[PDB]
Amino acid sequence: VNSFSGYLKLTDNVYIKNADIVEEAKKVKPTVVVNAANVYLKHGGGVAGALNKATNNAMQVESDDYIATNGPLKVGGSCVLSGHNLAKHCLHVVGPNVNKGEDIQLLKSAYENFNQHEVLLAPLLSAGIFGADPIHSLRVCVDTVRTNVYLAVFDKNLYDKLVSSFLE
C-alpha cells in the first residue's frame, strides 16, 4: 500500500533511504518493486538474488517462463512480472553493464521504464557488478524519471556518496 517512511526527499519526485530493498518491500507493500536484472532474468546475486530468495524462488520460475516466450531482454529494457510476496508487481529492468563494455547511455532507457508506473520502490541501476558511476546513475534517474521513485540504497558508503552529491 506504498507505506514509505523515513525517506529523504532529493527532488520533487525522487526520495532516498539507506535500507535493504527486501525489508522495505516487506514493510511498505509497494505496488511495484524494481529488480536490477540481467537480460536472462537469472537472479543469481546482488538485489536480484536477494529479491528472488525472498520470494522463495517463485520469481525465478516465473522469469524463466517469460524468457521462454520473449528471449533475452534488451539492455535498457524491462518486463513487468509478479511481485510475489514483496509487491503487486516486480519491474525487472536491465541497466547497461559497463564492466562488460555496454553503453552507459542505455541507463537513460533503463530509467525511462519507471515512467510506466505511478510509484516505485527501486534500487540504484547499473551499480554493483554493472560498474557505472553511481552519482551519474542517480543523476540519470533524477533527470529521466517523472513518476514517484523511492530509492533504497543498502550500502551505507554508497548511500552517503549519493546524498553528498545533492548538497547545496
Ligand SMILES: CCNC(=O)Nc1cccc2c1[nH]c1ncnc(NN3C(=O)CCC3(C)C)c12
Ligand atoms: C533479507 C536479506 N536481504 C538482502 O540480502 N538484501 C540485499 C543483498 C544484496 C544487495 C542488496 C540487498 N538489498 C539491497 N537494497 C538496495 N540495494 C542493494 N544493492 N545496492 C546497494 O546497496 C548500492 C547499489 C546496489 C549495488 C544496487 C541491495
